[PDB]
């Protein structure tokens, strides 16, 4: 079972981010284009239609630590959102509450995390939550 080292996995994810996937409703890229450690990523999720998240663009920060992708990335929303599993004061994504993170596998990726968060925005418990005004962001 041949493991691709962290840095080489992240280079794969960088190229895939540039090429884009699917319908482009999620996207990702390096926060700092001179960051050779490939640690800090910007994530983007278009809120899904027929939910209270619709027609809003969410920006996220995704941190790929030293043990990525053996270990899951850390994720937080910059754009304010009311969603189960997201701390509504700080934007931090509680790994235990998001199945892709709580049940992380090393075959997963930034793309996969973002698609899961988008899918969860469509859930019965989230899709009807009243949202903060568009354009607001958390501190720090």
């Amino acid at each position: 079972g041949v493991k691709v080292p962290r840095n080489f996995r992240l280079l794969e994810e960088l190229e895939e981010g540039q090429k884009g996937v699917g319908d482009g409703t999620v996207s990702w890229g390096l926060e700092d284009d001179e960051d050779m450690t490939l640690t800090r990523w910007t994530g983007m999720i278009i809120g899904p239609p027929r939910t209270n998240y619709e027609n809003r663009i969410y920006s996220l920060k995704v941190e790929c630590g030293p043990k990525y992708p053996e270990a899951p990335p850390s994720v937080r929303f910059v754009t304010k959102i009311n969603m189960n599993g997201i701390n509504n004061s700080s934007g931090m994504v509680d790994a235990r509450s998001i199945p892709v993170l709580a049940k992380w596998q090393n075959s997963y990726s930034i793309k996969v995390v973002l698609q899961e968060l988008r899918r969860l925005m469509m859930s019965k418990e989230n899709m009807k939550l009243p949202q903060p005004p568009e354009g607001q962001t958390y501190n720090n």
């Binding site: 493991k3 691709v4 284009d33 050779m36």
Partner: protein, 149 residues
């Protein structure tokens, strides 16, 4: 149950017969992953510096090229901001007959003789083409800043 003979062979020969000016050591967890240090070549603006590089041997090696990237910031028309290396044998011109040893000295040769004219060179290439003297001074500046510790 383990690695192909070729990989075992190349690994062991890397540690028995090291390339001049290049250290190459196995990762502590991944037998296909190596931590390399290249000395700046004599008479280049990188001379005196040491540059970290990482090397990975993919599943399909040697059909597939090794993956190589710099992990030390360097000012060079064929190495980008993320350390990625533009070099024929790493892509188009890779063939199984080439050893890791050949790739590594070829990378050293690239430091010794940059190719600013390469179709895939970054924005640093423009400096190298038009004001080469300044670009070489800047490569020396970055060697001082990033490659002396």
């Amino acid at each position: 149950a383990g690695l192909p003979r070729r990989i075992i062979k190349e690994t062991q020969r890397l540690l028995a017969e090291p390339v001049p000016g290049i250290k190459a050591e196995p990762d502590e967890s991944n037998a296909r992953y190596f931590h390399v240090v290249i000395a700046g070549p004599q008479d280049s603006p990188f001379e005196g510096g040491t540059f970290k590089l990482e090397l990975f041997l993919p599943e399909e090696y040697p059909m597939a090229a090794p993956k190589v990237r710099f992990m030390t910031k360097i000012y060079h028309p064929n190495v980008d901001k993320l350390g990625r290396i533009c070099l024929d044998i790493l892509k188009d011109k890779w063939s199984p007959a080439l050893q890791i040893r050949t790739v590594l000295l070829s990378i050293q040769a690239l430091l010794s003789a940059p190719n600013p004219d390469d179709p895939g060179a970054n924005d640093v290439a423009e400096q190298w083409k038009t004001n080469e003297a300044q670009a070489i001074e800047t490569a020396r500046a970055w060697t001082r800043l990033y490659a002396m510790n």
